[PDB]
């Protein structure tokens, strides 16, 4: 029983780590989208 418990714990740790890994990509993509629309409106001002 105890052995299965620790197995579960380690697997949980592994999964959550590799998940937040890609969550970093998520955060970065949102930041890229943000600054994009910023400069979009900027050049919109620069347009006419």
């Amino acid at each position: 029983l105890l052995e299965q418990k620790k197995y579960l714990e380690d697997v949980k740790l592994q999964a959550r780590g590799q998940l937040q890994a890609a969550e970093s990509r998520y955060e970065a993509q949102k930041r890229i989208t943000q600054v994009f629309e910023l400069e979009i409106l900027d050049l919109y001002g620069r347009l006419e």
């Binding site: 714990e9 989208t33 943000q34 629309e37 409106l41 900027d42 919109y44 001002g45 006419e48």
Partner: protein
Amino acid sequence: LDEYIARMVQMICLLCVRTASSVDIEVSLQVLDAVVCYNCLPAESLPLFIVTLCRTINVKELCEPCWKLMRNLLGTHLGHSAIYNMCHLMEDRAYMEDAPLLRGAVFFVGMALWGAHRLYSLRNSPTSVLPSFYQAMACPNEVVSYEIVLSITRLIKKWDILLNIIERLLQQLQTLDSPELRTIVHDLLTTVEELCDQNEFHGSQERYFELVERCADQRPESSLLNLISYRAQSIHPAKDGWIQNLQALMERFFRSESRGAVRIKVLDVLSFV
């Protein structure tokens, strides 16, 4: 010059509006100001020049009651250009001490927000315009943040996750500004803002920062049912382990707590677990 028709066989008009600018800083409080904005009115009835000045001078007026005149002027002014907002946000430096200026500016910009779109035609781009507001909040003042909260609440009556995260940071700085300028109005607007957030929650497309904001605003100012939904979502994760999280919540709501109702709540939650 009120006789003037929109014809321009002349050129020095830019200098005369420079003069209108120089003089409007000190005019009558109800008539000569009306006359100077009246002479500004036909300016849009003609092609115009670099008018960053027009921005910085048609802004410190929305405070006094003239709302409809400035509203008409600026609404019809928003034609033939959009860069208005750009310089507006370029007015977010060295101006932390210009409460009326930023007040009027952002209140007018709120036209670009869901409250009332009398133009309805320009590129929406709200996510872009938002963080300019976070900047403008660099200095804590009542009325500016007041119009800000009123404008954001109107906007949120409705997607773009970035919109959310930004306004999240906005209200975060808001709650940061609450413990110091403890007015007896923004308390309301803030907590009822949390409420209406919890109502459009079902179609919010937002994140869970909301809940942790309550943890920052755990001061009982926040409603009780707020705390109910809060503990519900916060126990929602705890299913097999993460005991430390459970006991941290337990502390925050069994030892450090007054309303026994939520104490019963957390207790039965523990019992279920």
